Symmetry: C2
Subunit: 305 residues, 2 copies
């Protein structure tokens, strides 16, 4: 009954992780029904990445140019096309583990789970958040390309992220399951770099409510603040500016605790200008910004799948 | 690159979670082959929990006394027995989703994944460490009892933990899959409290190498140190004393980074003594110790 950055159960997703190899290039594929999705750069190699003409490289590819391995069974690819940055492979077998699912494009600040895979093999799962600067500070080794990000609603897996690349700063860039990159990032080797990041203020506030819910509330005060004054302070400390929308998304939580959002902003304000003073909140020495308002209700309602 | 506190994929464990009910008590259970494992206290209510006698309690129960369900479907229990603080119930169906598994008793400082369950349904997964005082700093609402901690090596699930209860300080206590409690606790409403919790020195050094490997190394310095001198400081700060066994274990990571273990101890002596100075390591504002050296080498190569 503490509080823990929890990942969704990865069971339904593990069942869709396969291996996709093109010559010497091996990475991960997403097998949903008779389609396998993966990053199109699987048809690349060293030289290729520097200004690749994906269309012309793909033309030189036959269906036999790909080997697809689900466990120890080989999947026969019978069709292939490109959809934006993804390769779509058509296999002769509809994945018997296909879960109820859907594809979504998430928004900056929003969190999800990542099942890290290699050679088609799920190696681990963690939570992370789409950074305001459109990157995930993840943990990926070579051949992790293809690992996916997802959330879960009741029955339905919502796929929202596929991994393509690591930026110079060690941060990470990828696409939604439609092949569109998040951010201005391209799957070429160019001099693209992550712009400056900021703290997801919405998620800090949700976390602060979390603490209060769990009876951890020493930081609350008697005053309130305006949305302006709050944004004048936050942007000094590199926080995303807070919007009336953000305020409304915090609705349920502020209702649950009976603490208004601008009243909670006052608390953040003093936590920023004055720091934490060797105190903790939910056992943390620093403020957390990778819990969304919905994560908090989720974990605090013992929601189940 | 990057460094997250990853759990193992929970898929294999999901397929053995079930709901076990007795009277008006319901908790989770583990379904491997034709046997269901759950905490023996599923047979307690109100009175019982304050100083019970699980021996007299069980004799008064039949197979019929246990409602077991994989999802909406009831499983016929054709047998029951007590094993230490566990209850074992034989069922008439084998579990097809039963994976390659084994029961292991881990040691404080080691890490595992927990699959938090309610009514036999998964809520989430997370990685943690078995504390030196034998508790785990978990996230377990009411009814999570019977959820399991595990590790996965290859195809094979190693179960090491089944959750039994929560202590006054809001931390958690449980048993290996053989029914024996980690640490001196009992499944009774009593005045038991957790011993002194210390930082897991070995894990912290591992995590400092994880920070070096990932480019974060402002905390490094010219000095080195002796084992004795490091322990004299580290103990001042409620840190586990460090041993040669511990240093040896750290070999591979020192050989990876260049940095000698003892040099890293000297860096760690500075951190303990000076605080972090408003800076972070791998984004963290406090030293992190739920990573084993085996954990770090694996995630970092």
């Amino acid at each position: 009954s503490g509080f823990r950055k929890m990942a969704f159960p990865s069971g339904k997703v593990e069942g869709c992780m396969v291996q996709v190899t093109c010559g010497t290039t091996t990475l991960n594929g997403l097998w949903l029904d008779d389609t396998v999705y993966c990053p199109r750069h699987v048809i690349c190699t060293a030289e290729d990445m520097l200004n690749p003409n994906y269309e012309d490289l793909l033309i030189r590819k036959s269906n036999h140019s790909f080997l697809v391995q689900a466990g120890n069974v080989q999947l026969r690819v019978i069709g292939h096309s490109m959809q934006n940055c993804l390769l779509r492979l058509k296999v002769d077998t509809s994945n018997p583990k296909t879960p109820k699912y859907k594809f979504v494009r998430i928004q900056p600040g929003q969190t999800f789970s990542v099942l890290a895979c290699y050679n088609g093999s799920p190696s681990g799962v963690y939570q992370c958040a789409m950074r305001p600067n459109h990157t995930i500070k993840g943990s990926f080794l070579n051949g992790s390309c293809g690992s996916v990000g997802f959330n879960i609603d009741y029955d339905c897996v919502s796929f929202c992220y596929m991994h393509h690349m690591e930026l110079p700063t060690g941060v990470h860039a990828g696409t939604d399951l439609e092949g569109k990159f998040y951010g201005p990032f391209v799957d070429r080797q160019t001099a693209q770099a992550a712009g400056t990041d900021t703290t997801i203020t919405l998620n800090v506030l949700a976390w602060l409510y979390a603490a209060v819910i769990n009876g951890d509330r020493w930081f609350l005060n008697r005053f309130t603040t305006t949305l302006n004054d709050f944004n004048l302070v936050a942007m000094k400390y590199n926080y995303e500016p807070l919007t009336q929308d953000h305020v409304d998304i915090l609705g349920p939580l502020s209702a649950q605790t009976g603490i208004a959002v601008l009243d909670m902003c006052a608390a953040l304000k003093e936590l920023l200008q004055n720091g934490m003073n060797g105190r903790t909140i939910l056992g943390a020495a620093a403020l957390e910004d990778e819990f969304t308002p919905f994560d908090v209700v989720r974990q605090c309602s013992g929601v189940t799948f």
